[PDB]
Design a protein around this ligand. Structure first.
Ligand SMILES: OC[C@H]1O[C@H](O[C@H]2[C@H](O)[C@@H](O)[C@H](OCCCCCCC3CCCCC3)O[C@@H]2CO)[C@H](O)[C@@H](O)[C@@H]1O
Lengths: 278, 236, 272, 232
């Protein structure tokens, strides 16, 4: 079972593209995911994943680039979320719930009129085994762009995530780096559609990062661990789905969930259960 | 010279601060005192421009908002997330980030400042350690070391002595006394009414309005205090 | 358009059951949905719906009723969330997201072994156009049980949602009504597997409630309006899906969202 | 009588409230004063068992947690959601909910108490209003009206004179004086040090521990206040 998987990666061109795409998604989603959970944006990660769908669908029929539509509809949601709060008694979480599900429903309608039933199922859940070369190289390009952007603004993202009140006292544009992460989040979301699909994007952001949060002693250490857990969980899940003939996206997420479950007990910081016991 | 002129703040409908006008000369260690939740902490935020406010504030002719590099702000320990993954030296190094431009990193020059700041506050052995693995006193000294590396002419501390041991309290106060000797204004929002004449040479008693302001002996009196804490309605 | 729909409701059998089932889901999700948004449980509402999937999946394999598995796995998720908070550094919103996505993935695999992917799609997104009589009568029965429980404990659900701090001072079991409300939530979730589906239940919970929240001057009035907007959106949504041959579940959600968008501007409280 | 034994409440690491032993006698209007965030409001929640605490509390040869029907707790305005859809009379009627069992409704005799309670606090013509439409002072009178309909022998208020107009203060205070005349105990957590001998005949100074407790003129001194607010 392990032997023929290695053999398949040598023969087949579709399994090679599945491996490289799964790796890159796992690395980049886990890297961005660190900032998502540290800044308290776990909900927003799920909301933007849903808000991107109608933009990706509308960008297809118009004949435009997939990443452009994701940002427009991704920002339209964030505008509405803030606009609902600012002009009514509707709470924040309710505004995020209404706008995310409404955009999700809109996306399903726009996909249905243009594309087939199998395309909708794949957009929502994965299709890692049928990614083309152009999609693979663009995923590497945009994925590497996300990483080097974080590398450039690492010091600025550090203070704003840890101590935003100190950043404001120094005169830093805290709003600029908030929108930067949301611009990066949309690029991760459309990239993650290939492996885990629209419905399970949130898992690839928060689950590896949450696991790395239990171990890491620094932001750099946390990103490295979050990407390693995400990348490893992406490879194992591919091996699980391909061999046992089960959903690749769910297998990838369950592997990440099991890493969190194992780490929840065996992590040094988690072994402060002795504190609560006595 | 700090220069506040008709500064006001409103968190929700009601006024947190009401027409604040003041001119603070230095060097000094000035203590902002009064009821907790009445304006003490909001003044430092409104002064810096961290929150919306109706009014202006200046630092030696030039405006506060256009001279933030000259100021250093040390917020309360409650606001900071202790569980965040960051070492002590890495937390202190954050004060230098404004001096570093984009596409540039911390050379050996900058890390030397960080370790010296820790040697002053007495945490040279805690540099390679998590901020979660510290006491309230020790963590406060890290925030003061983070303040030192900015080399700010003005220092704003929000309840620094709230919930710390006497060993840390003395080390912190020695550091602030050195900053006073360097010729710099140190403005501190105090958490209670403890050691007022010992710590502070000037006092700013705040309860929405400015109740009293001046030298400690002259202003730190039962008449002024009971007007503030009694809210203009103190009965004997 | 309208004549064809009315003609269809007389001749076609699934369209009759689709109408009846959609009404009942709209009414009950609207009523329960009021309590969700007033107590600030919109986030938890979405997670419980996802946590229901593995229970309903595992229930079919063992041959038990879907409601039993959903309640067990639904409350299991809620227990795990608080357990993550209390025994780790991980925050609430992260803990909710982790458990719901993990349970959803677990449900997809558990459905995969017994059922097919078309069955997974129907559980997750509707199958409104093919609900059977046995399913309709169960939906009406369980839906009526939800409305009765709300009617019986109305004063108790009112005081705990508005002023829980007073209810604690009076000596009321505040946790009992919190768990009672989450049981109603899980019953609506499995009921919603025959209209909007597991993924879009939250929409039918919070959107009709939020729309009614703009008009309502009391909780009784709010529930009436939320169920009215919930029922009407379920009817017009089915009409859109039937007429234009598109996903009815999504059409029902967009219709509910459109009422909210209109109500955002025209409502008396929104004006003043 | 409200007797307390070694009542403590932990915030997280350190104690918010530390070993409170006390015996309060009635009838009275008692005032709990001290620094904001230093025990005042926590004492009432720990006493009623609203939050987890380590000590005990008694009401007349009986435990407080088995006598909640005899107490009326009026929380701070800040905690209450004003946007919640509810009329003034409906808010007042919430005080009657304990007396109504399951499968039963509010009869005409219960609305009589709601209409009478509003008339006592001068909000008879605001019965059909939403609580969002009322002012700060008016809303406190609604909470006091909600307290009156419970008909409690013990009344626990939390900063009821904080941020209100003087017309409301007069109405509220006159209502509390009448409760003391009816032989009932009133325990108020005061927001500042305003009008201490006017409001209170007994005063309880609190900063983590009990700094002082007793009649106002004797206990409300320069020394006790310095010990409480000065801390060190
Ligand atoms: O358009 C032509 C293709 O259409 C299908 O493949 C589609 C399929 O409809 C869907 O299952 C998947 O969705 C994958 C996720 C789509 C979301 C956008 C992904 C982004 C990733 C970053 C680069 C741009 C695309 O796409 C592939 C093509 O790649 C068929 O396999 C075949 O007809 C052909 O290969």
């Amino acid at each position: 079972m392990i032997a023929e998987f290695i053999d398949g990666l040598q023969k087949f061109h579709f399994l090679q593209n599945a491996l490289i795409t799964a790796i890159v998604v796992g690395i980049v989603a886990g890297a961005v995911g660190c900032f998502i959970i540290l800044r308290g944006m776990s909900l927003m990660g799920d909301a933007i994943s849903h808000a991107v769908l109608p933009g990706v669908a509308l960008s297809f029929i118009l004949g435009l680039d997939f990443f452009i539509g994701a940002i427009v509809f991704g920002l339209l949601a964030a505008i509405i979320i803030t606009y609902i709060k600012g002009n009514s008694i509707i709470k924040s979480d309710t505004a995020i719930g209404i706008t995310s599900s409404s955009f999700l429903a809109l996306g399903i309608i726009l996909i249905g009129v243009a594309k087939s039933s199998t395309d909708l199922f794949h957009i929502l859940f994965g299709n890692i085994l049928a990614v083309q070369d152009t999609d693979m190289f663009i995923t590497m390009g945009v994925g590497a762009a996300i990483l080097l952007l974080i590398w450039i603004f690492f010091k600025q993202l550090l203070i704003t995530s840890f101590d935003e009140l100190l950043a404001k006292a120094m005169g830093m544009p805290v709003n600029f780096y908030h929108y930067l992460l949301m611009v990066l989040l949309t690029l991760v979301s459309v990239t993650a559609m290939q492996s885990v699909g629209t419905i399970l994007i949130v898992a690839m952001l928060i689950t590896p990062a949450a696991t790395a949060y239990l171990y890491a002693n620094s932001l750099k250490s946390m990103i490295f661990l979050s990407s390693t857990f995400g990348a490893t969980a992406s490879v194992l899940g591919l091996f699980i789905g391909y061999s046992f003939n089960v959903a690749a996206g769910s297998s990838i997420v369950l592997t990440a969930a099991s890493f969190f479950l194992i780490s929840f007990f065996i992590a040094p910081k988690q072994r402060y259960l002795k504190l609560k016991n006595k | 010279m700090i220069r506040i002129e008709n500064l006001s703040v409103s968190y929700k409908e009601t006024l947190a601060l009401k027409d604040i006008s003041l001119v603070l000369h230095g060097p000094t260690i000035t203590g902002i005192i009064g009821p907790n939740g009445a304006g003490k902490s909001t003044l430092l935020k409104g002064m810096l421009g961290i929150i919306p406010h109706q009014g202006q504030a200046f630092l030696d002719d030039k405006e506060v908002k256009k001279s933030l590099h000259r100021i250093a702000y040390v917020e309360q320990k409650i606001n900071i997330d202790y569980n965040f993954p960051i070492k002590v030296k890495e937390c202190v190094s954050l004060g230098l980030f404004p001096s570093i431009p984009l596409f540039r990193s911390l050379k050996a020059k900058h890390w030397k400042k960080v370790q010296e700041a820790l040697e002053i506050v007495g945490l040279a052995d805690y540099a390679e350690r998590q901020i979660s693995q510290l006491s309230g006193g020790q963590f406060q000294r890290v925030l003061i070391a983070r303040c030192l590396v900015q080399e700010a002419d003005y220092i704003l501390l929000d309840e620094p002595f709230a919930g710390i041991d006497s060993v840390s309290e003395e080390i912190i106060m020695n550091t602030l006394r050195d900053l006073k000797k360097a010729g710099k204004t140190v403005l501190i929002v105090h958490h209670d009414l403890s050691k007022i004449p010992h710590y502070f040479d000037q006092v700013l008693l705040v309860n929405r309005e400015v109740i009293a302001f001046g030298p400690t002996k002259e202003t730190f009196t039962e008449t002024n205090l009971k007007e503030a804490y009694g809210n203009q309605l103190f009965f004997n």
